[PDB]
Amino acid sequence: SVLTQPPSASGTPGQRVTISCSGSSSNIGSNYVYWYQQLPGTAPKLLIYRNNQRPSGVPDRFSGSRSGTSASLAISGLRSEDEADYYCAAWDDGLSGSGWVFGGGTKLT
Amino acid sequence: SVLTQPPSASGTPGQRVTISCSGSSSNIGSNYVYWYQQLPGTAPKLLIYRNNQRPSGVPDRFSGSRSGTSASLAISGLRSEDEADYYCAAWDDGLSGSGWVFGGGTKLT
Amino acid sequence: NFRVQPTESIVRFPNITNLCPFDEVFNATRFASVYAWNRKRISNCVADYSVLYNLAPFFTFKCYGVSPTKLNDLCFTNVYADSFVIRGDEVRQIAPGQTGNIADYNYKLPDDFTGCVIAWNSNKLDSKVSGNYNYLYRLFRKSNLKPFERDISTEIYQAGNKPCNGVAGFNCYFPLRSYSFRPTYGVGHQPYRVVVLSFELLHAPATVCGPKKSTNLVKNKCVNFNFNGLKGTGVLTESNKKFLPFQQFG
Amino acid sequence: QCVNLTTRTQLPPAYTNSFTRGVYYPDKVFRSSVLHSTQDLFLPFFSNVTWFHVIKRFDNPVLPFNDGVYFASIEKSNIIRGWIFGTTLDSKTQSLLIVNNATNVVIKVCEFQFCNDPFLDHKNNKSWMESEFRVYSSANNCTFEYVSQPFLMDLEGKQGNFKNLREFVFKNIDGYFKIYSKHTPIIVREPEDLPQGFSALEPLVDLPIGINITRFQTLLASSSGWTAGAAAYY
Amino acid sequence: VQLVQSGAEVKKPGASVKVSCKASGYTFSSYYIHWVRQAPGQGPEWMAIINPGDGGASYAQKFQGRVTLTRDTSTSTLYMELSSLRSEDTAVYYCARAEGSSWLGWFDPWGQGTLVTV
Amino acid sequence: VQLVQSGAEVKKPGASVKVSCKASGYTFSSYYIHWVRQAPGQGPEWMAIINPGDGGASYAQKFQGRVTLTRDTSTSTLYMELSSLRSEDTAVYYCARAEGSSWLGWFDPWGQGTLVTV
Ligand SMILES: *[C@@H]1O[C@H](CO)[C@@H](O)[C@H](O)[C@H]1NC(C)=O
Ligand SMILES: *[C@@H]1O[C@H](CO)[C@@H](O)[C@H](O)[C@H]1NC(C)=O
Ligand SMILES: *[C@@H]1O[C@H](CO)[C@@H](O)[C@H](O)[C@H]1NC(C)=O
Ligand SMILES: *[C@@H]1O[C@H](CO)[C@@H](O)[C@H](O)[C@H]1NC(C)=O
């Protein structure tokens, strides 16, 4: 549908917080989700497949999961380098259009 | 808030004069109001209690009461000793600081 | 065929006149901490939740499953009285679907939550000039807890990958953090006493409710005024038949 | 705490015909000088019922519970104080309790630190006294609490001429727990079998727990030398 | 084994803006091509999915018909010709790569994007 | 039953001043002390609260950190220290008694005050 996202994600260096996308029916519970991180000044880069495995290789300090109609990503060992914007992408399959819809926008502090 | 007061209260002896202190929300509606008299050359004194009674002893000609989000004090029987100035005090409970924001400043002739 | 129609009309079941001891779990002096929130499954009396306008600053009054206008008319079953003291900024994230430092590690609500929360200012009452370092919360834990769960353990958090036991230091932090409450703090930082209800209309038969209405006594009239009660019309007269103490109807 | 009392043994229980007992008021809707038929749970007429006897005789048997149970305790000494409706009693499933000691009539349906056989009876052998008093260190999961009028009990006891006759009917329908009783403290005969007669049973209390129970016990109230009175129940 | 964009600048509103990026690397007939638009300060919106060879095209609801794409195999160019530009049409375009013969799955790396303003 | 003050003179700008006012009469250890300053052309503003014994003080937003507060019972001298004195802070400081272990209430009569100028 619209894929509501929190406006920001608070954090301090050296701890674990969770960032989540909440969606409607037949958008998150139907198809898989995709997590994305946008570093400033760089092209965006893939970080996870369907949340059961790592695509090429990342340390396992980041863990993704689904719960009902929402998806969540727990991050630990926070650094000042990883302060970026997080996005989620999903296949919508809604009425009058079924595009690759994205989430809102969050900022990591 | 700011608790504005008129700069002066022109009057004559034998005439009743009313001074009004204009407050804001959450200062006069719930918080009690105090009227203080500043004397020249000596220490300030507790002019009146909460607006029902006298501190230690005074004629009931000194009247004071609150209404809405404002306060008022009616003083009659003006003498040479009554030539002074008054202040209004109210609890603040404001944003980023909850000290004692007093009133403005008046002048009685 | 002619017929006489009734005038003042009602039906006769409500007969209550029961006492209801309250305003002590709501207006206490000592209250629970953030993680020390306790449960009172209230099944004592009427528990009128509508007469709460004596205290003006009840800023949190929204309720989701039921409306306050139609609150004290239906019957609930096993309502939970959970009370804790938090800051004013955390009041806005008590609602389900919110995120924060208290919605994942201390106390979280289900997405199908029934009930609502009542909060009010308690800074003058709960804030000393030297501070009140007795209400404390936990920020560090191994994993996120389930809703309606209490954590009591004060073991040292192993944030880093270094073996430490008991003694703190580098990458070994104390999870429980005491609040720094002062009366000069602004809105949202003052200590706010918070009470939340969970009606949970399931499982057991309903126990806690009361209409408590009343009417008059006008003998031998073609009306139906009857203590606002159970269905049934007619006229009301005086009958001399005898009942045993547990008898109700005829 | 848990004690290995053990000595688990069984005795052949005597069987006696119950003639016309266990008739109670069905509903709280009434009528006068008429005849009416009800399709309810009753004790069938001229049935048979077990008879447990207390003499060096100990008996707290395992009794199955199903769709309501009728008791008839005939006694003067008043050893019996309550009933435990518990199937596990290991503090994971809820168990009932009927314990009101002297003046406080608090009944706490809760999970304490209770073992398989947490005794609640006697003291210095024959005398009547509390169940080691302190029975739980702290409350972890408590569910129900209710105080009522104190039941008609007699202090100490007397053997012979069993005046007290407590008839009870226990039912558990759609979460409601219904207790019916007709307390008749008038009989001067030999105990033997059930007395011949008819008496209705008025309701006393209904408690909204919401759980189901299919297993219960009884709460009769040193190593060498046991002295106890005589009792009987059905 | 990489994709680079083309250069552009500000154009007049209500006109046509040509945008393109090259394609090189692996085989071409069995890999779908995604294009996606991203606005600064917000989330990106999915633009188009293209099958090479026969040049199959599909477009979203908000861009159906108002945008035109063309594709080819031998020259390996991928054109859009934007028309009806608003202040909403000031964003950065990205051309991508897919799994191949399937429009569901992970997204292969994008280019450097093209910024367009009115 | 009266509060007496100390004296002060002209101080250099950007320095720290110390005021101690002796209190006699009521109980020293069970009565809060309000510290205010009165300036010409304006009214008095609260700037410090004194809890005797441990000296636990809750300063305002504009008076936090810049004010050093010390309370005792043996010497019975309420030490107040101000840093970064300028020409704006030239005022008469007053220390007054309060309700005692409760902030809200009336105000006790004030002392003669100590005038500080820069
Ligand atoms: C009872 O006996 C069993 C069998 O060994 C033993 O495990 C248990 O600890 C004993 N309990 C007590 C209270 O003696
Ligand atoms: C019923 O009671 C009689 C004793 O009168 C006994 O002999 C018989 O076995 C009992 N029947 C059952 C089914 O228990
Ligand atoms: C009954 O409860 C009261 C509670 O006030 C207690 O003081 C008293 O000791 C209790 N009596 C008992 C348990 O026999
Ligand atoms: C009687 O009570 C005392 C109290 O300590 C106890 O030591 C003793 O064993 C008891 N005797 C009997 C026969 O119960």
Residue numbers in the entry:
A (entry chain J), B (entry chain K): 2 to 110
C (entry chain A): 319 to 568
D (entry chain B): 14 to 68, 77 to 242, 256 to 268
E (entry chain G), F (entry chain I): 2 to 119
Q: What does the study report here?
A:
Unlike structural studies of the apo SARS-CoV-2 Omicron S trimer with a major configuration corresponding to one ‘up’ RBD and the other two RBDs in ‘down’ states, the XGv051-Omicron S complex structure revealed the S trimer adopting only one conformational state with all three RBDs in the ‘up’ state. In the structures of the Omicron S trimer bound with the other two antibodies, the S is observed assuming a configuration with two ‘up’ RBD and one ‘down’ RBD. Distinct from XGv051, the NAbs XGv264 and XGv286 bind patches surrounding the right shoulder of RBD with a similar binding mode and the binding region is broadly similar in locations to those observed for LY-CoV1404, XGv289 and XGv265, antibodies known to potently neutralize most VOCs.3 Specially, structures of XGv286 and XGv264 resemble those of XGv289 and XGv265, respectively. Similarly, XGv289 and XGv286 shared almost same epitope residues, revealing conserved interactions at the interface for their high neutralizing potency. Both XGv264 and XGv286 paratopes constituted five complementarity determining regions (CDRs) with heavy chain and light chain contributing ~60% and ~40% of the binding surface area, respectively.
Among these variants, Omicron, with a dramatically increased infectivity and enhanced transmissibility, is rapidly replacing the Delta variant and is poised to become a predominately prevalent strain in more than 110 countries since it was first reported in South Africa at the end of 2021.2 As a newly characterized VOC, Omicron was classified as the fifth VOC by the World Health Organization (WHO), with over 50 amino acid mutations, 37 of which are located in the spike (S) protein. We obtained cryo-EM reconstructions of these complexes at 3.0–3.8 Å and performed local refinement to further improve the densities around the binding interface between RBD and antibodies, enabling reliable analysis of the mode of interaction.
